[PDB]
Amino acid sequence: YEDKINVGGGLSGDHCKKFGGGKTERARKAMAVEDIISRVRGGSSGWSGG
Amino acid sequence: STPFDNEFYNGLCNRDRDGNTLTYYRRPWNVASLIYETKGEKNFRTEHY
Known part of the structure; x- marks a missing residue:
């Protein structure tokens, strides 16, 4: 504002x-x-295991 | 091996009629008895982490 003096x-x-x-x-x-x-009681020397 | 004699036999033959084929074996007097029970088995197992 400016009037008589300036401000x-x-x-x-x-x-x-x-x-x-x-996150x-x-x-x-x-x-x-x-x-x-596996359990087999077959009765053969080899074939039961085979 | 065998620490003793296993061929000697005392008296009358004791039959060993068993096995796959038709054959007759002898059982020594030192051995009380021997069987031909041919059991068999196998196992398998797996696991994952």
């Missing part, structure tokens, strides 16, 4: 903020159990 004024304001977050988790598991048993 000067000036102001400025600016602010900026940016936040960020990122990712991955997991994988697997289990398999296979057992085979």
Whole structure:
């Protein structure tokens, strides 16, 4: 504003903020159990085992 | 090996009529008895982590 005497004024304001977050988790598991048993009382010296 | 004699026999022959084919063996008097039970087996197993 200026009248009989001059007066000067000036102001400025600016602010900026940016936040960020990122997370990712991955997991994988697997289990398999296979057992085979064979008992033969056949009566041959070789063929029973064969 | 054998630490003793296994061929000696005491008296009347003891028959050993058993086996795959038709053949007659002898059992020594030192051995009480021998059988021809031919058992057989095998196993298998798997696992994963």
